[PDB]
Design a protein around this ligand. Structure first.
Ligand SMILES: *[C@](O)(C(N)=O)[C@H](C[C@@H]1CCNC1=O)NC(=O)[C@@H]1[C@@H]2[C@H](CN1C(=O)[C@@H](NC(=O)NC(C)(C)C)C(C)(C)C)C2(C)C
Ligand SMILES: *[C@](O)(C(N)=O)[C@H](C[C@@H]1CCNC1=O)NC(=O)[C@@H]1[C@@H]2[C@H](CN1C(=O)[C@@H](NC(=O)NC(C)(C)C)C(C)(C)C)C2(C)C
Lengths: 305, 305
């Protein structure tokens, strides 16, 4: 039936996007009820960003200094506060298009959709994974700050990410909706190093189950392995260790295909040691780790929202 | 800044999705103003689909036989007609969430976003390209029929595709919003062969410009070539011929990067003859042809809708 990197329908999130302007800085904001959430560096000038004192710059700002716009319509700011690296601008009007929502902090290895926005207007939507080094491989230009990452559960929008900065080699970093950065990053234009990234093993295994479901079965060998032996091989190839919790999460795909997780582990062990010999799996020449076991089932067994 | 397969924000299209039921068949419909558009095989039973007479089966159907639902809310059907392979069900209520729209027939090689739906509910959004053989590499299960492909131009939704069937190796076929199939396909469960696919050359060249913009420049050689010589090489590798119209369409990227189209053609000619030696371009190990020159500029120079 086909397998694509599918993003969540962005509608519920689009109705929340606002444009936040302070002084000469404009970025995106998330308007849920009577509160607007945006990165705190909206109160910075290009020079402050080199080493800023956010608490100090916010003292010198009053409510009227924040120009918040939902399309053409300006929202009056009646309060402002700082929660970590995020600004909460209270507005005189509650967002009527606010969906049922939660603020979650995703774990590394989990996926989400990013609705990239410029001037409070959505330009596109794509699926991302929180890398083990706490970064994301996104597509963001100047003005994309404030764009959010999310997941949908029938009617509930679970917001997990807000864009803040770009790192070397097109890697991106940001915070949860409580202003807490994911990883060892700070909102300052100073040298900051991202840790070594690893391949999300449980996601590669889920992608191998998606391939069998879809008819691509060539890589399947006639062997099994132990959780210990597999982890010895994977360690060399910069793959994160597979835990028994990862084995249980993979249960549904294993039961659906009839392939025990440890037999799929033996097939993956062979693809790491022998290579793919110029062959593809689900049209891909590289092993993919940006599809969780849930993304696989939701896609290959039509979960709607 | 990063480069991802980005889809258009699905919001404007989500507000148009309905569930269409006739007898025991349920699929998706597009509700624009007081009309619902859906595949005509909604009036078929599993046995009719083997060799159906749509004109005959539609005679035996009256308005009340179509159960149309927008969420919980049932829409009363006050008229029905057939335009090619599509059904137009007139309803007593105009869709208040209808956006400014057009119905276009895209040319092969062009891209669009697919909002995959089940029971009139959106499950996800992804970017597709109309293959030169008039098929799409989508992700559709049973119940996905009626899901639509589209493009957005600031506020205008240009609907170009409606899902009808699946072809061998996870390839998909459908119609424009006037019920005309793309390619030599008919809505019947009989053996039908899809032509040989080719690689969209102008899209690969646009993707090579996206890579230079993003800093991946290793594949750039110190040579130029003629339009004729390049097309001789490309022909062997199953690449469509590059026309002078394709050269002019690539102008903006060429002017932005300072790389003449024929110099980029020489670099591509070398990648076809010598291979990539295990290297990647924009994180990809294979040459990508599902990004038009417009997708490149819109992404690398933030066009919002
Ligand atoms: C954001 O402020 C906006 N308005 O879009 C912007 C988004 C960036 C710009 C290019 N692509 C993006 O994703 N973010 C910033 O300008 C933040 C901001 C100031 C510096 N900054 C950066 O992202 C810089 N990166 C950086 O310093 N990276 C280190 C060295 C820390 C790993 C830079 C060089 C402008 C991309 C602060 C407060 C961090
Ligand atoms: C659609 O009717 C729905 N309700 O979703 C369904 C969508 C299919 C089912 C699996 N994945 C999809 O995208 N489409 C159909 O069932 C259409 C319909 C009947 C047969 N059909 C097919 O897609 C079949 N394919 C087929 O016959 N392919 C040929 C041999 C013509 C190239 C099949 C085998 C059910 C997938 C009609 C009227 C064409």
């Amino acid at each position: 039936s086909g397998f694509r990197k599918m993003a969540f329908p962005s509608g519920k999130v689009e109705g929340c996007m606002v444009q936040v302007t302070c002084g000469t800085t404009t970025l995106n904001g998330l308007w849920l009820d009577d509160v607007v959430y945006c990165p705190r560096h909206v109160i910075c000038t290009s020079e402050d960003m080199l080493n800023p004192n956010y608490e100090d710059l916010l003292i010198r700002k009053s409510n009227h200094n924040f120009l918040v716009q939902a399309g053409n319509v300006q929202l009056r700011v009646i309060g402002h506060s700082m929660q970590n690296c995020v600004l909460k601008l209270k507005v005189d009007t509650a967002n009527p298009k606010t969906p049922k929502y939660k603020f979650v902090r995703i774990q590394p290895g989990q996926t989400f959709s990013v609705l990239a926005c410029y001037n409070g207007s959505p330009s596109g939507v794509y699926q991302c994974a929180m890398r083990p080094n706490f970064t994301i491989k996104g597509s963001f230009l100047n003005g994309s700050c404030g764009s959010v990452g999310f997941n949908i559960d029938y009617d509930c929008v679970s917001f997990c990410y807000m864009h803040h900065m770009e790192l070397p080699t097109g890697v991106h970093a940001g915070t949860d909706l409580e202003g807490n950065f994911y990883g060892p990053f700070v909102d300052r234009q100073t040298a900051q190093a991202a840790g070594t990234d690893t391949t999300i093993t449980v996601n590669v295994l889920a992608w191998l189950y998606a391939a069998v479901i879809n008819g691509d079965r060539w890589f399947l060998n006639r062997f099994t392995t132990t959780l210990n032996d597999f982890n010895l091989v994977a360690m060399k190839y910069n793959y994160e260790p597979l835990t028994q919790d990862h084995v249980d999460i993979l249960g549904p795909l294993s039961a659906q295909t009839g392939i025990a997780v440890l037999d799929m582990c033996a097939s993956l062990k062979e693809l790491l040691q022998n290579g793919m010999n110029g062959r593809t799996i689900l049209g891909s020449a590289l092993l993919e780790d940006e599809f969780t076991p849930f993304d696989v089932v939701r896609q290959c067994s039509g979960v709607t929202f």
